[PDB]
Symmetry: D2
Subunit: 501 residues, 4 copies
């Protein structure tokens, strides 16, 4: 029994736990957390920790990101970036952009852990996006080492002629829906932190599925689970809440009364259930359209008003209320019993119909804000006014809440906006409190564009194409990579080699 | 015990082996192998096989590539491609180029299996390059399914308005020096075949090391291990042999008589070994000068022209050269001695480095001797060059073709070259066709993928940092739309419709 | 250098040839119990222009041939969850199938190396990667042994081992790890890594076990088959139902679940089943002949209350059968008569449906049974039609036993423990691993190198 | 231009450098480094570093390991363990053993990163063994967490009925050769540190290749390359030097003077170079006999036929040793090293005890622990090996591989088996390990149980597995709790 020992002596267990809860409570008092709500205590967090404290460089980048985005919000400016594929691209973005985005969409088509690509359905294995974050972070880390060495090796007077690129640009990545239940969310979060992420975003859709939402309660839990995992690991990982309620058409359950005001119901008492009808149509293929119309689906508020045609007094009192207390309000104002069934128009998967929109999205963001360092509302157009509506809507309740914007390529920016305004779109939005903006898929498109250009030219005229469209433009622009050996770290590793010999 | 069974019943083992050995024999009679030397039997091969025979899509692509390269060589045309970084890129390449190249260099800086990058030393883990091959090949396969579906879902009258891309462009990949001994070479070759490589290339350098060479014997075994493993897995993998002898300055050992003509020696009988001196000094370029290093033949001829007499110096010299061409040092020594040439002082041990490497004077003639040595064990050959010299490229081809006239060649359109300062634009354009006439039937820009991606990224982010969203519309989205880039309607391109018709089929 | 991949003039004829081939395939005996809700034409539409053949298919064919002859004789193949290659080379001598456990994987083989209880929150690359691990090892030791046997003279061969290492593998696909697209991606991985058959549960991912409706778990079972078709393989699909012990269900939308959904019966407040008909059809039946509420006792998550048990599980197994090559119902205890009721309930509609059984280690086999009945338990269940049986966690438990046993003894008496507790018994049993170089393939690779030089 | 900035302002670069180089020199003075030669300067090391400082759990386990082995050696005791395979095993070992070993041999047969198995030639991808380290180490961190939670979730008055296992047992693993050049070594060392390793060992073999040695200078370089990598990430990683000299017959080159005493030469002036011969013919064993190969010092004695020679010639560079003879009036000795070279180019060598000791001594200043690969449980040889290195460096930790292949039932009486580890620990062998123990234990139960289960079914699971597991108090028999079910449902409840 020479090698048997306890792992923490029982005479110190209680006394170390105290010492640690005092450190966590004192950590939680830092202004980093002044907008953050934790429905758990330091005691429950520390009692899940083990005896070996791990420190992550993720944390340092979270902090770096937090400093950046606050000066961004306080000055009503914006950091903006785009969706990076791979280390060559990240080394060039670092010269001009202070954040890095890692897209799940680009990852679905370029970076799945199983190599099986496809559309953006978050059906890649969930190591995918974190593994891409590491791919970039380890390349950032490396080029930092390479450059530092080149600088410090030369005389101070001479360093003015050398490049001084900030490669350590903090990374924000897509956690999708969280890839499962709340045990998966914490595990996913754990990978993002182990792999270098400075912040992640998570969205209120259902996984495995118009878009289908989860109840607000389910998404809050997610946001808490992320925070619960960063606490425990001791890190300042930004968490970002995305709502897909603007164009969502379905919801999994009707159990959260915050969601009631938007759930659509059939107002036709003669109609049987849709699912009953669709199944018991046993003989047929490729009728749902008419059950829909003949059911005259409405929000309950609209259904109440339409019966009335008191209305105004109804809307004022009913705002935010469950279905039961909205019926009750109405019939207390002399309104007949309205027929409102929201089971009947359920899909054959069991899902509920919803009418989303900008109002449903403000509701969800405000619900999510105590648990989210930043928010965004996916939208169908790059319309500045809708953006101001949403932002004033959220800032009515929480005027310090940071916001984030997706400058999407799913938009046709020629037929959506004049050139003079494309130029001003980030600056204006920043004025509303969108301190972080990003183009999800630029990496994909830039790459597809020059590969199409060059492979064509190269096919037609050969090595003329490499000189004219690649190697000579590189020179004139001063792109470091044209001197590829020096860029790859050949001089850095040569000095390592000699230091050892 | 009614779950206990043999594997094959002992009464059928000898028979199954005879059938297989027959199949391998018939297979090796295919014209594919008409230039192929196999220093092993079919029985030896089959004895290494198991009871479950596996079939690889790699094989399909190797067969597809072989037929392509055969057509090019005979017409003296060329297939040319470049080093592909990623699936997005590979989907664009597939439109215009019939092959794909996967680079060790690009992989070292963008694709190590450990995510740790660095200069091209082949010190990434050896899963690195095959994993990139699976990366591209699995995307090629997907985009094939997507497009076959969209096409077949439309009626014949409407299919000509639809893209019809060959996404299955065969992949050629870097295997470096094989990453260790012959067993790793076999293990490496096995990963490549499992992940979809049509062909692989391997260099005559020494791993872990002014390039250092391995002896000809050692590199020939690499090339044989490859073939011995493709045989076994029953596939038709192309094995490309690359020699770095044109620029190399060093070699691991002096044991191969085919390298004895290029190995350098000291001709100064007074000097102490360079290693003994360097150790005792705890210069070096100083010892070298006083060492007066030379290939043995030149050392022998310089003795002939310094030795009155020897009354017939030009006739002794000439005769020695013709007789010693391709001979060991020992055999060369005897011949000169048989000719009345005084004993020559020649020490090739004394200039060894502190690592124990021998010096060597490479260059084109050494590269030629190496390629001729590798040729029967290689489906294609190349010689690394220091600049795009057409003439040296022609001297190298003619040297190989003097002995093996039908030996396919490969050329590296290196971006380590300065193409503005090597060649006018009009001659830039003809270069690949010129090289194709000499039988360089496969050509490739190794790092084009890295540089194209670097260039769009440096100029799009700069603009983006400058004029925001106008940059994206100016530089990216509008040009995509004008050029008709399929990726620009990116949901369709990713297969949004293919997967939708997949889940509707199931529900 | 620009070519089209399939000329337009050959597209239709090639599509035609291929649809005819799939139909001639589906007319094979292997598919005589199998319901496909889609056509060959649809399936080919989802294929590309390069056919890939998989070793998986040979193993699926081997497994079918195995279980057919076992079911026809009311016999049984039985195995256990294998952890790891050393173990699989030892199993291969006495057991003809191999099981790969999600439970064992969650605790020892997750792709992220982060362990935890069996909640299927590991990356879905986890279990198919464990199939490859064992399979790649199987194919090796097969090549090693074939060389040794064929290197020797037939006279001396009977004195050599002759193990079937290619023992067909069955693996846990849990719930599918997502919606149907993920199921097909997951199914695609197993077929590529070498699975002979996979199994999949009617639980809900992310979650008193909670159920999915019958229709959702049929789709899982069709997505699987549809991915095997397309890839051209004969993957065996095992449907598992956790109904005997389930208490919740995600939605009420399916009419086949109505017969078991528990409703409230105190009008005062804000539990019993109603009684194969729907509820609207059930009420209409009762008032064609002369109060029931299930939205109230919903959980805070929106789940419906339900009453499981053999009745609920016979309902579900009969729904899945046309879509499944084998059925099993996970039980709380190893109860013969319960196993007789289940088999009888299913065979009363599908006499021919193969069955599977979990000889659970979650059980207490000393308490629940005597040693004589222990020896016959498998044999008896085989009479019922359970043709494939397995101990999920035997691998985990054997490894933990000998490890605790040996690490302890080795800590007390050094190398005496290694000689006494390991080496000496290894030789008395004639364990091939004791000659470790040879076992590892040292002679195989040696001859490989010698053949190259 | 609102997003561009330099990463370190030029005005702070010189100051930050100076302060970090200050931290390294302070760090290098710790007692931990008192035996350690560093052929490079703090300035050279920090010049390779980046701007972002990274802390590794490896470091903590390095420091735990060192503190364990320091005590073992002063006390002339030993830590022992064996080659662990997988997390189920490591949670069981943790109860009774204080270190964990990760084997290349086991990993080649059970854990390659490509899933392609094979005999120990270190020809798997070099991600293989660091990946196994992580496999085990992430398992240790979880069970540590799970058990801390169980214990803290219980009143103090009740904890003594609960387990208290040290799952954070420091891991030592196999770096083989380094898997190539020195850049490969640093990259491989870099992985081990990122993945959890407390220590690693590396060998003087040539990769890709009787055994073939590298020259002494080359392996020293490997060691320095490990330590430099560790000194960049700022970790106390243990570096173990293994020599394979005692059974080695080949070496790659003769360029290193310290190897000269063991390289065999030809003593026959009548013979042509072996390779010259073998080639013309395309007989070796005949040549090897007729060449009469001896190490230089023996061919010199035979010529004399002396004591003053062997006294002066020890560890000298042949060109020196030859002149040593020339000074003592000794005729021209005919020795040729290059003749007996193999067809691959390798030199012949005669290893054995005196070679391993010579190499061990040359490695020690770069090695936190030394060991000589042994094929045989000979106590007397362990003594001679130890006493030799201890003549020069008496405080060198040593390590020892306990043979799994040898027949222990006959090698030694039972009682001497019981004492073997203790007897070696008295020589300085403070860390000891059976490499393949994990493989054999798994192979023993699997054969044993699979047969019984094929024969008597479920009876065999109760009789040979479930009942003994209960009677022994194996925490795994309650598998749900052991997996950490209670730890995770408490996690979830904390959230919701
Ligand atoms: Mg996404
Ligand atoms: Mg390379
Ligand atoms: Mg499971
Ligand atoms: Mg090893």
């Amino acid at each position: 029994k020479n090698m048997v020992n306890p792992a923490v002596e029982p005479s110190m267990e209680d006394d170390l736990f105290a010492r640690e809860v005092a450190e966590v409570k004192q950590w939680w008092s830092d202004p980093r957390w002044r907008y953050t709500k934790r429905p758990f205590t330091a005691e429950q967090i520390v009692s899940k920790r083990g005896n070996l404290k791990i420190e992550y460089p993720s944390n340092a980048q979270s902090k770096k990101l937090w400093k950046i985005l606050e000066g961004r919000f306080q000055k009503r400016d914006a950091s903006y970036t785009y969706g990076c594929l791979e280390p060559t691209m990240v080394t060039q973005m670092a010269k001009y952009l202070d954040t890095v985005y890692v897209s799940g969409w680009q990852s679905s088509s370029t970076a799945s852990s199983s190599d099986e690509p496809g559309p953006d359905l978050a059906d890649y294995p969930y190591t995918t996006v974190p593994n891409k974050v590491s791919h970039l972070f380890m390349a950032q880390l490396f080029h930092d080492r390479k450059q530092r060495h080149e600088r410090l090796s030369a005389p101070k007077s001479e360093r003015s002629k050398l490049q001084n690129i900030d490669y350590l640009r903090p990374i924000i990545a897509d956690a999708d829906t969280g890839h499962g239940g709340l045990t998966a969310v914490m595990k996913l979060t754990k990978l993002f932190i182990e792999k270098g992420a400075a912040g992640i975003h998570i969205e209120d859709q259902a996984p495995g599925t118009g878009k289908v939402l989860v109840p607000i309660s389910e998404h809050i839990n997610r946001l808490v689970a992320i925070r619960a995992q960063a606490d425990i690991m001791g890190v300042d990982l930004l968490a970002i809440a995305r709502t897909d309620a603007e164009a969502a058409t379905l919801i999994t359950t009707s159990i959260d009364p915050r969601d009631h005001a938007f759930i659509l119901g059939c107002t036709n008492p003669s109609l049987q259930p849709l699912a009953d009808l669709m199944n018991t149509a046993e003989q047929s293929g490729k009728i749902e359209d008419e059950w829909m119309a003949k059911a005259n689906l409405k929000r309950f508020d609209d259904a109440v008003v339409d019966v009335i045609n008191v209305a105004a007094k109804y809307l004022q009192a009913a705002k935010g209320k469950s279905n039961r207390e909205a019926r009750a309000i109405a019939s207390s104002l002399g309104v007949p019993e309205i027929f409102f069934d929201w089971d009947s128009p359920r899909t054959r998967e069991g899902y509920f119909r919803i009418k989303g929109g900008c109002d449903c999205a403000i509701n969800r963001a405000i619900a999510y804000a105590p648990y989210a360092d930043a928010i965004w509302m996916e939208s169908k157009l790059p319309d500045y006014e809708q953006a101001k509506e949403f932002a004033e809507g959220v800032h009515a309740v929480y005027p310090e809440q940071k916001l984030a914007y997706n400058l999407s390529p799913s938009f046709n920016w020629k037929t959506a906006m004049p050139r003079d305004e494309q130029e001003t779109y980030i600056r204006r939005l920043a004025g509303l409190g969108y301190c972080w903006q990003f183009i999800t898929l630029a990496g994909l498109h830039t790459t597809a564009l020059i590969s199409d250009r060059f492979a064509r030219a190269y096919s037609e005229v050969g090595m003329r194409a490499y000189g004219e469209l690649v190697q000579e433009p590189e020179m004139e622009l001063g792109v470091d990579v044209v001197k590829h050996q020096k860029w790859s770290g050949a001089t850095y590793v040569d000095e390592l080699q000699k230091m050892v010999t």
